[PDB]
């Protein structure tokens, strides 16, 4: 019984999480926005609901938390990926953030196969956010190039 | 019935919302479209939908781009949210830039169905390959309906076969 949240989590893991960790794992020395790091953590922000659109929401979170854009050029044919870095207090570890824009799909999808967000629809979009977070945590913990390097957190 | 919203439906929406209309919006915005230094008078954006999920999507796409002699191109330029990487036919594009992409999102259906299979087999079962089949068809139908229901994509994006 495949939940959409489950496919989306796997899509985001294979095509974004792994791709980013690999890019950073392939640099002899990690150098982000021209400062050298000895290690990294990659924080996946799960939103608490789908009331605000994810791109709008993420932008608010990153401004609020004063963390700024950084492009990581992938070690494949030079394709930079987009994410946010918290460059604070001369830390050795590069503390990176993303909020999965793929979650947008769930809001639009739910609101398209249904005015006012019913507690029934709220409990449905709640269930998907948790299923996505749970799948994602499982996938991360199941590969040595992602485990210890990736954190799934709440907004 | 509990919402029978297929995964392929949500993935097709996400691809449309966060990629197809992001690309069109970047090209519609350009006073003149300039790709790898070339001016184009308009564009068409072709979404290659794979016939199956036998081959991994990125392996597949490489094969299609290489067999079509299509080339890498960077769009959205700079300081426009984030840059995008596409494939263009520099050989047969005149006034119209012909752009390609194979949805990498389709890659999540394979690995998902492969996870949820309750046993290991040499290759794949007929039933397994039936689910893949009908999920790719739903994605194409969902994308074609999304594309056609908007001025900003309707003439500009086309779903093609591998
Ligand atoms: N370059 C990138 N920049 C930022 N986040 C990235 C990313 N590549 C992947 N992700 C994240 O991973 C999700 C799944 O990516 P996937 O490649 O499987 O599926 C993607 C992919 O097929 C396409 N797409 C989106 N952004 C793309 C990009 N910059 N280049 C190429 N394809 C992109 O649209 C699908 C849905 O994207 P969506 O945002 O809904 O959801 C994306 C997004 O949340």
Author numbering:
A (entry chain B): 154 to 267, 272 to 312
B (entry chain A): 151 to 312
Article excerpt on this structure:
A recent groundbreaking study discovered the ancient origins of the cGAS-STING pathway in bacteria, which play a similar role in the immune system to combat bacteriophage infections. Binding of cGG to bacterial STING causes it to oligomerize into long filaments and activates the nicotinamide adenine dinucleotide (NAD)+ cleavage activity of its fused N-terminal Toll/interleukin-1 receptor (TIR) domain. Depletion of the electron carrier NAD+ eventually leads to bacterial growth arrest or cell death, restricting the replication of invading phages in infected bacteria, a strategy called “abortive infection. In this study, we demonstrated two distinct mechanisms underlying the regulation of bacterial STINGs and a structural basis for cAA recognition and oligomerization.
Epilithonimonas lactis STING (ElSTING) was identified to bind cAA with micromolar affinity. To reveal the molecular mechanism underlying cAA recognition by ElSTING, we determined the 2.57 Å and 2.55 Å crystal structures of ligand-free and cAA-bound form of ElSTING, respectively, which forms canonical V-shaped dimer conformations. Binding of cAA stabilizes the formation of the β-strand lid and further induces complete lid closure to seal the ligand-binding pocket of ElSTING. This results in formation of a more compact dimeric architecture than cGG-bound bacterial STINGs. Recognition of cAA by ElSTING is mainly through shape complementarity. In particular, the hydrophobic sidechain of Y165, F169, and L234, a lid residue P233 along with phosphate-backbone-interacting residues N168, T254, and T255 together constitute a more compact and limited ligand-binding pocket to clamp cAA inside. In contrast to the cGG binding mode, there is no room leaving for cation-π or π-π interactions between the sidechain of R230/F232 and the bound cAA. As a result, the bound cAA formed a self-stacked, triangle-shaped conformation in which the two adenine bases came close to each other by inward rotation of 26° and shortened the distance between the 6-NH2 group of the adenine bases to 3.3 Å in comparison with 5.4 − 6.7 Å of the U-type cAA bound in eukaryotic STINGs. The base recognition of cAA by ElSTING was mediated via indirect hydrogen bonding through water molecules: w1 and w2 bridges the side-chains of the D251 and N3 atoms of the adenine base, whereas w3 mediates the hydrogen bonding between the main-chain of N168 and the N7 atom of the adenine base. Binding of cAA induced lid closure of ElSTING, which further oligomerizes into spiral-shaped filaments via lateral dimer-dimer interactions with a rotation of 30° per dimer along the direction of filament extension.
